[PDB]
């Protein structure tokens, strides 16, 4: 079970410098007396790593409280520890560090390691209570108080202790690198004896890989596990803990860097060069031996003034829609279509597009658009879609199996219904045969239901083709009128006459920008020019292609283009 400790009080951060530490072996091959360039997650040279005391005495009274913040895990962690008496015991990794997410626990007791991957209920202050025996004192018994419950474990690992026994100024430096790549938790480690150096020593030591555990959990957060020698029930005035935390641990974060590593004759990494540190390091990496374009700020798009618009208002906002035999097939061409109007307006109950997604209508350009506008009862507006049947799908409107276009319907109670009933919309129930593609049959011949001919006169088994619809404002939703328009789009190998609206932006002069002038794309700086273009000649050209000047589509001013300085 866990034990509650005091508030961490958010101690201000303190930094230190990492003199070329944290270099490990990137690949598992033997290399001898060779200089190899590797791009990987390395700790940058001479970086600022944050250092925490295991025990910090900061209160005026002399309070001894651990400094174990929950630190980020950004693309790997270089964890160094300089200590003398094994106060650091392990780590916990996880996203929420609770039962909602899986968590990784590594602990080094006096005998072995414990690596577990379970959804532990980690408390606010996980730690190991370490006590010596009354007679031997050679080893230390540890009481785990780091999680409340362990369940649903998916991993278990035991091996030789990561941290050796440290049982008086012979401080030791233990360096670890933690990476979480491709479901693999990789740990690199190295142990060195350090003498009379408070911070990370100056020198080079390469980290040999330790374990490559296959683990799917994401981490992005971690904490260090420490051991209490003192008692939480009774905190002593002083010296109950271990000499007020002279030992400490440093944390740095790996970054994607290119290193030049020098494998000596025995195969150990003796030296490394960080290519992004200083210009001379850049030269060393370029020569593979130990002995520039201005970016564009933003993008600019300019298209000419939008002038021609579709007569969608004459279709959708029309006063009267025709019957269900004579569809108002209207041709639409040679003008710009803004379908964001009918889409974002969302006044239409049904809006179904087949063969085209409804959000990319503004981007596609079509040869022709055909609009059919009419009025139909509720259920039947649901019926209009390809491959279906029914009285309307088989007797009035013929709709192909493959149909590129959009059916659009809205309710029309307040427009098409009258108190006495609008019988001006007529519907058929009888025909000799089903329709063929886009046949607008308006024939009024009397159908012969029986075996005798009708000769254009009703009677027994003779009926007029056209019945009336009782559109009334009190009708139920299924029987209510709906104004519907089907827009069929033609995409064939011909020039487009119906095009979406092109969205131009503002003009930025005298600045390195990405530009798009009427389809001409490029990067460069634009300046006012005194050139003399003709009424035509939208974009000028130099001696060898490479357009020097362009004409702004909206404003006829000629802007000359200079390549962005490099």
């Amino acid at each position, epitope marked *: 079970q866990c034990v509650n400790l005091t508030t961490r009080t958010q101690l201000p951060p303190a930094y230190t410098n990492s003199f070329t530490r944290g270099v490990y072996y990137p690949d598992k091959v033997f290399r001898s007396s060779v200089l190899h360039s590797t791009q990987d997650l390395f700790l940058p040279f001479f970086s600022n790593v944050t250092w925490f005391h295991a025990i910090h005495v900061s209160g005026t009274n002399g309070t001894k409280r651990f400094d174990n913040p929950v630190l980020p895990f950004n693309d790997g962690v270089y964890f160094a520890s300089t200590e003398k008496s094994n106060i650091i015991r392990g780590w916990i990794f996880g996203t929420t560090l609770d039962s909602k997410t899986q968590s990784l626990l590594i602990v080094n007791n006096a005998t072995n390691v414990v690596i577990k991957v379970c959804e532990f209920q980690f408390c606010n202050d996980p730690f190991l209570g370490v006590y010596y025996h009354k007679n031997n004192k050679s080893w230390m018994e540890s009481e785990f108080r780091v999680y409340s419950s362990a369940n649903n474990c998916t991993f278990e690992y035991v091996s030789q202790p990561f941290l050796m026994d440290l049982e008086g100024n012979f401080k030791n430096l233990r360096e670890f690198v933690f990476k979480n790549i491709d479901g693999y938790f990789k740990i690199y480690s190295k142990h060195t004896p350090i003498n009379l150096v408070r911070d990370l020593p100056q020198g080079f030591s390469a980290l040999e890989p330790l374990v490559d555990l296959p683990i799917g959990i994401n981490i992005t957060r971690f904490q260090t596990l420490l051991a209490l020698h003192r008692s939480y029930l009774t905190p002593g005035d002083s010296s109950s803990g271990w000499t007020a935390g002279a030992a400490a641990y440093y944390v740095g974060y790996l970054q994607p860097r290119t290193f030049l590593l020098k494998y000596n004759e025995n195969g150990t990494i003796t030296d490394a060069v960080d290519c992004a540190l200083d210009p001379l390091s850049e030269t060393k990496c370029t020569l593979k031996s130990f002995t520039f374009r201005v970016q564009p700020t933003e993008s600019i798009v300019r298209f000419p003034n939008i002038t021609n618009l579709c007569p969608f208002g004459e279709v959708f906002n029309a006063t*009267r829609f*025709a*019957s269900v035999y*004579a*569809w*108002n*097939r209207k041709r639409i061409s040679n003008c710009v279509a803004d379908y964001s109007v009918l889409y974002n307006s969302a006044s239409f109950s049904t809006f179904k597009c087949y063969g085209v997604s409804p959000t990319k209508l503004n981007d596609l350009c079509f040869t022709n658009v055909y609009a059919d506008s009419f009025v139909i009862r509720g259920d039947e507006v649901r019926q209009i879609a390809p491959g279906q049947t029914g009285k309307i799908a088989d007797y009035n409107y013929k709709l192909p199996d493959d149909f590129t276009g959009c059916v659009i319907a809205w309710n029309s109670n307040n427009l098409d219904s009258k108190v006495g*009933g609008n*019988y*001006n919309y007529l519907y058929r129930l009888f025909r000799k045969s089903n329709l063929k593609p886009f046949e*607008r049959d*308006i024939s*009024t011949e*009397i159908y012969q239901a029986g075996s005798t001919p009708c000769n*254009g*006169v*009703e*009677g027994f088994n003779c009926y*007029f083709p*056209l019945q*009336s619809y009782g559109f009334q404002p009190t009708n139920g939703v299924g029987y209510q009128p709906y104004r519907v328009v089907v827009l069929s789009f033609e995409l064939l190998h011909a020039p487009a006459t119906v095009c979406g609206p092109k969205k131009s932006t503002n003009l930025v002069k005298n600045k390195c920008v990405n530009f798009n002038f009427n389809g001409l794309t490029g990067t460069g700086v634009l300046t006012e020019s005194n050139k003399k273009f003709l009424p035509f000649q939208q974009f000028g050209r130099d001696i060898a292609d490479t357009t020097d000047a362009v004409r702004d589509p909206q404003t006829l001013e000629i802007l000359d283009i200079t390549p962005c300085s490099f």
Partner: nanobody, 115 residues
Framework: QVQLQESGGGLVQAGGSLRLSCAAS????????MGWFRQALGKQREMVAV???????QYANFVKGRFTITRDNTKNTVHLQMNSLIPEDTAVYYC?????????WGQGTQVTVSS
């Protein structure tokens, strides 16, 4: 704006006669089909008769041998000769221009026959 002018109705005693007129203006392309429809208060739209551009006559069984339609090609107008009147014919009538799309109606002619 296609307009259908209505004329020729009114009050007539049983057995009388009238001559209604359907006048078409506007686009009215060459293939038209003009008809007359009946509506009495409390009933729906009843097809009285139709003539297409072929000049064929299609009449309903309600009025066998009583109504007649004549065409005028010069003005493309229509006339109902309305004879042998009975009090079951008391209903307002309307033209119907089939044309090709957006069928247009007229404003109506009241027909009353009673004694």
């Amino acid at each position: 704006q296609v307009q259908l002018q209505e004329s020729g109705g009114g009050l007539v005693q049983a057995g009388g006669s009238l001559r209604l007129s359907c006048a078409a203006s506007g686009s009215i392309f060459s293939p038209n089909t003009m008809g007359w429809f009946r509506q009495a208060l409390g009933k729906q739209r009843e097809m009285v008769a139709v003539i297409s551009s072929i000049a064929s006559t299609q009449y309903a069984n309600f009025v066998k041998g009583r109504f007649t339609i004549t065409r005028d090609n010069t003005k493309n107008t229509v006339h109902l000769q309305m004879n042998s009147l009975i009090p079951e014919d008391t209903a307002v009538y309307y033209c119907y221009a089939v044309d090709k799309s957006q069928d247009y109606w007229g404003q109506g002619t009241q027909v009353t026959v009673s004694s």
